[PDB]
């Protein structure tokens, strides 16, 4: 049935927790608090700006979300500390299974794509950094449609770039809110649950719940 | 310039913290954790469901947000405990200044309205409960437009029900994310900052920042 796979980037293939280290060495002890508030602010800004029809690229939203987090925690964030800390995302590390799981996936002749909210500038940066560029067929950014997920205009891009119907495209995501929208759109959905989280209560259920990409490779 | 005022309900005129008590007497010690996660889940569900174009009334979203919160904290939430705890919102208490501030406001002949996300069922319940029904001209729900804030289709309702241009309507809100959307829409905005929070980093700034409704009454 499936001939392609649309992956999320942050949290699904690459660990966001990689930022904590660089956040802590700038604001000692506070490094874990700055990141937890950073990611929630990012997500909330992309969703709200979309609803307000006031779009700005992901790089902009990530910078604004940090500026708020630091100001909210009373932390003093100068210009330079803002750049290197935002530069941290462009160097995330993939979860241990990812590299080998992707390799065996492509070996089965399936089309692999990344449907991420990050700018095409960011997407290529983290993927190439991990040396995983030679593994994906398409690196899809939401920038063109000028709106963020879970807006359906985003999910279509994946259906158009892969040249396959949504029914032949497996949607893989760690974020249960994205897997809810994708399922509504029509994609068969696989939720990656490494931390034993519970699904969102927005009326949907993923077709598959797994603990790592290892299980995705075994679905074939 | 201003001839009318559009108020938010939860957090602006009525205290959400009123729920903590009834939450704690059902799950002792955990009462403050269940509420903090409840409100964030409510907001996130209204925003996401809007973007997914999958609307359900506020009463539904408040019930789903609790079902998740409890399941996320491992708490066992039976049928009855879900009803009385959700019934808690229909009995919130207004901040001390609210009752008198609203009275002196109407005395100045300004039109007062509530533009809330809650169902018209909820809005009238909490307002009448506090005996504040005789103080508002219109009780606007988002239910008709089938979408939640900060979507502009919501802000228009206020401009249409009051029969005034957005420039003659003061938008009062405690939630800085709502005051950002309203300002974009065109309303003069007053942010109620009682907890000394910092504004969102979504490109906007309210026209007025105050600590209570007392300052709003003095703007006239």
From Swiss-Prot, chains A, B:
<dbReference type="GO" id="GO:0018784">
    <property type="term" value="F:(S)-2-haloacid dehalogenase activity"/>
</dbReference>
<dbReference type="InterPro" id="IPR006328">
    <property type="entry name" value="2-HAD"/>
</dbReference>
<feature type="binding site">
    <location>
        <begin position="116"/>
        <end position="117"/>
    </location>
    <ligand>
        <name>an (S)-2-haloacid</name>
    </ligand>
</feature>
<feature type="region of interest" description="Important for catalytic activity">
    <location>
        <begin position="173"/>
        <end position="178"/>
    </location>
</feature>
<dbReference type="InterPro" id="IPR023214">
    <property type="entry name" value="HAD_sf"/>
</dbReference>
<dbReference type="Pfam" id="PF00702">
    <property type="entry name" value="Hydrolase"/>
</dbReference>
<dbReference type="InterPro" id="IPR006439">
    <property type="entry name" value="HAD-SF_hydro_IA"/>
</dbReference>
<feature type="active site" description="Nucleophile">
    <location>
        <position position="8"/>
    </location>
</feature>
<feature type="site" description="Important for catalytic activity">
    <location>
        <position position="155"/>
    </location>
</feature>
<comment type="function">
    <text>Catalyzes the hydrolytic dehalogenation of small (S)-2-haloalkanoic acids to yield the corresponding (R)-2-hydroxyalkanoic acids. Active with 2-halogenated carboxylic acids and converts only the S-isomer (or L-isomer) of 2-chloropropionic acid with inversion of configuration to produce R-lactate (or D-isomer).</text>
</comment>
<protein>
    <recommendedName>
        <fullName>(S)-2-haloacid dehalogenase</fullName>
        <ecNumber>3.8.1.2</ecNumber>
    </recommendedName>
</protein>
<dbReference type="InterPro" id="IPR023198">
    <property type="entry name" value="PGP-like_dom2"/>
</dbReference>
<comment type="similarity">
    <text>Belongs to the HAD-like hydrolase superfamily. S-2-haloalkanoic acid dehalogenase family.</text>
</comment>
<feature type="site" description="Important for catalytic activity">
    <location>
        <position position="12"/>
    </location>
</feature>
<dbReference type="InterPro" id="IPR051540">
    <property type="entry name" value="S-2-haloacid_dehalogenase"/>
</dbReference>
<feature type="site" description="Important for catalytic activity">
    <location>
        <position position="149"/>
    </location>
</feature>
<feature type="binding site">
    <location>
        <begin position="9"/>
        <end position="10"/>
    </location>
    <ligand>
        <name>an (S)-2-haloacid</name>
    </ligand>
</feature>
<comment type="subunit">
    <text>Homodimer.</text>
</comment>
<keyword id="KW-0378">Hydrolase</keyword>
<feature type="binding site">
    <location>
        <position position="39"/>
    </location>
    <ligand>
        <name>an (S)-2-haloacid</name>
    </ligand>
</feature>
<dbReference type="InterPro" id="IPR036412">
    <property type="entry name" value="HAD-like_sf"/>
</dbReference>
């Amino acid at each position: 049935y499936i001939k392609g796979i649309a992956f999320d980037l942050y949290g699904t293939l690459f660990d966001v927790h990689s930022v904590v280290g660089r956040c802590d060495e700038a604001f000692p002890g506070r490094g874990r608090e700055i990141s937890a508030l950073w990611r929630q602010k990012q997500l909330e800004y992309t969703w709200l700006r979309s609803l307000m029809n006031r779009y700005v690229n992901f790089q902009q939203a990530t910078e604004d979300a940090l500026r708020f987090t630091c100001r909210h925690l009373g932390l003093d964030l100068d210009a330079r500390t803002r750049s290197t800390l935002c530069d941290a995302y462009l160097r995330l590390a993939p979860f241990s299974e990812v590299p080998d799981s992707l390799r065996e996936l492509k070996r089965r002749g399936l089309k692999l794509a990344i449907l991420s909210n990050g700018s095409p500038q960011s997407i290529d940066a983290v993927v190439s950094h991990a040396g995983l560029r030679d593994g994906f067929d398409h690196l899809l950014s939401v920038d063109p449609v000028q709106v963020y997920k879970p807006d359906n205009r985003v999910y279509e891009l994946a259906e158009q770039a892969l040249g396959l119907d949504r029914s032949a495209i497996l949607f893989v995501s760690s974020n249960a809110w994205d897997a809810t929208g994708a399922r509504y759109f029509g994609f068969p959905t696989c939720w990656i649950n490494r931390t034993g989280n519970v699904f969102e209560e927005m009326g949907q259920t993923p077709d598959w719940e797994v603990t790592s990409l290892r299980a995705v490779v075994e679905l074939f």
